[PDB]
Scaffold this active site. Structure first.
Site, mmCIF file in Angstrom:
data_model
loop_
_atom_site.group_PDB
_atom_site.id
_atom_site.type_symbol
_atom_site.label_atom_id
_atom_site.label_comp_id
_atom_site.label_asym_id
_atom_site.label_seq_id
_atom_site.Cartn_x
_atom_site.Cartn_y
_atom_site.Cartn_z
ATOM 1 N N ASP A 266 0.851 -1.190 -0.053
ATOM 2 C CA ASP A 266 0.049 -0.137 0.129
ATOM 3 C C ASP A 266 0.808 1.216 0.010
ATOM 4 O O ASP A 266 0.335 2.228 -0.214
ATOM 5 C CB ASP A 266 -1.033 0.075 1.173
ATOM 6 C CG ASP A 266 -2.310 -0.488 0.916
ATOM 7 O OD1 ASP A 266 -2.519 -1.360 -0.215
ATOM 8 O OD2 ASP A 266 -3.245 -0.380 1.588
ATOM 9 N N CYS B 165 -2.243 0.685 -13.301
ATOM 10 C CA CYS B 165 -2.087 0.589 -12.052
ATOM 11 C C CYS B 165 -3.361 1.506 -11.442
ATOM 12 O O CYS B 165 -4.408 0.937 -11.995
ATOM 13 C CB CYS B 165 -1.012 1.122 -11.350
ATOM 14 S SG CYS B 165 -0.170 2.543 -12.119
ATOM 15 N N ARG C 117 3.295 2.905 -10.920
ATOM 16 C CA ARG C 117 3.619 1.434 -10.828
ATOM 17 C C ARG C 117 3.907 1.187 -12.548
ATOM 18 O O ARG C 117 4.716 0.360 -12.723
ATOM 19 C CB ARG C 117 2.959 0.618 -10.008
ATOM 20 C CG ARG C 117 2.530 0.822 -8.612
ATOM 21 C CD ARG C 117 1.410 0.091 -8.237
ATOM 22 N NE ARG C 117 1.022 0.232 -7.063
ATOM 23 C CZ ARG C 117 0.055 0.833 -6.501
ATOM 24 N NH1 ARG C 117 -0.676 1.653 -7.074
ATOM 25 N NH2 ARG C 117 -0.012 0.915 -4.963
ATOM 26 N N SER C 118 2.973 1.533 -13.327
ATOM 27 C CA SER C 118 2.926 1.061 -14.689
ATOM 28 C C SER C 118 4.240 1.691 -15.384
ATOM 29 O O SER C 118 4.900 1.147 -16.202
ATOM 30 C CB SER C 118 1.707 1.697 -15.589
ATOM 31 O OG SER C 118 0.368 1.322 -14.860
ATOM 32 N N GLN D 291 6.074 8.055 -10.119
ATOM 33 C CA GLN D 291 5.451 9.285 -9.201
ATOM 34 C C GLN D 291 6.265 9.435 -8.079
ATOM 35 O O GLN D 291 6.055 10.409 -7.429
ATOM 36 C CB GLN D 291 4.213 8.551 -8.561
ATOM 37 C CG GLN D 291 3.008 8.725 -9.789
ATOM 38 C CD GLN D 291 2.818 10.267 -10.094
ATOM 39 O OE1 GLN D 291 2.134 11.051 -9.405
ATOM 40 N NE2 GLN D 291 3.620 10.814 -11.302
#
Lengths: 6, 297
Positions: free
Chosen positions: B180, B214, B220-221, B261
């Site tokens: 998370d 994601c 994450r992608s 990110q």
């Protein structure tokens, strides 16, 4: 903070 | 020299700074369609839009908009579709994109729920018996089988274009163990997940681009794509030492904004490529030396 994203 | 850079940066603790410099230099192109008032509801995030130039156009004469971008890595010879996790009203569009783009694999780097909140809709059928029909797009989606491993699930889905009576098998790669908060402490599971995606043939140029998502389809992608492309170029170039993850990243940001990110995701990608390259570059002793690491029974 608000729904979207950064 | 990437091993150098990782150590050099970590010791110095300049990850935010290295990262922020990449944010500052990032390309910026108009996102006209994405911001159109009629597409407000197709955007999970108001601040995460596909550029007009690389956006995926749905082949519906209706409204061709989907928050999805075509990342074409010319030199790496690979294309990816990076997209947000489908919203409840964009699940038909997502599968329509999958269908029209001839994608064989869909890579989900998130969980439907993360941080106590929904990061993506349940866009695929959890039960073989409860197929989903996308009435707006006229597609049928059926779970054929799934293979739950410890850090990822590979599902065999059957997508049927109800209009043409034509059916395709879509492999769903779902990395289920991304935490998370923060990134995986080791790149081991991600990399092994990456290699099964690769191994399935989902990323081959014989198929449409793999659909990677994601929640926003950027962090994450972006990690997945950056790492995979940097691995492509190393184990392709005269010297793997020449691959620059920052320049790779910046060429990818030409196609979709904000790929990667956090400075921790950028560090996770350096980790991933550094470790992924070691195993493939020349450890003749192994290829997939992620036994204990990814565990596996």
């Amino acid at each position: 903070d608000a729904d979207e994203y950064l | 020299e990437m091993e150098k850079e990782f150590e050099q940066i970590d010791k110095s603790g300049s990850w935010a700074a290295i990262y922020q410099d990449i944010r500052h230099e990032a390309s910026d192109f108009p996102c006209r369609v994405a911001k159109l008032p009629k597409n407000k509801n197709r955007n999970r995030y108001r601040d995460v839009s596909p550029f007009d130039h690389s956006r995926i156009k749905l082949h519906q004469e209706d409204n061709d908009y989907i928050n999805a971008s075509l990342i074409k890595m010319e030199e790496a010879q690979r294309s990816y579709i990076l997209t947000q996790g489908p919203l409840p009203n964009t699940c038909g569009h997502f599968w329509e994109m999958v269908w029209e783009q001839k994608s064989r694999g869909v890579v989900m780097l998130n969980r439907v729920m993360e941080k106590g909140s929904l990061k993506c809709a349940q866009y695929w059928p959890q039960k073989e018996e409860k197929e989903m029909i996308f009435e707006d797009t006229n597609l049928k989606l059926t779970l054929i089988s799934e293979d739950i491993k410890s850090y990822y699930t590979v599902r065999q889905l059957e997508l049927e274009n109800l209009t043409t009576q034509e059916t395709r098998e879509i492999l769903h790669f779902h990395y289920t163990t991304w935490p998370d908060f923060g990134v995986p402490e080791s790149p081991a599971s991600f990399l092994n997940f990456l290699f099964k995606v690769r191994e399935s043939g989902s990323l081959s140029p014989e198929h449409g681009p793999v659909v990677v998502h994601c929640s926003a389809g950027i962090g994450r992608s972006g990690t997945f794509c950056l790492a995979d492309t940097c691995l492509l170029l190393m184990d392709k170039r005269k010297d793997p030492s020449s691959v620059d993850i920052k320049k790779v990243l910046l060429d990818m940001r030409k196609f979709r904004m904000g790929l990667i990110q956090t400075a921790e995701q950028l560090r996770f990608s350096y980790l991933a490529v550094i470790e992924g390259a070691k195993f493939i570059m020349g450890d003749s002793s192994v290829q997939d030396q992620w036994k204990e690491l990814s565990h596996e029974d």
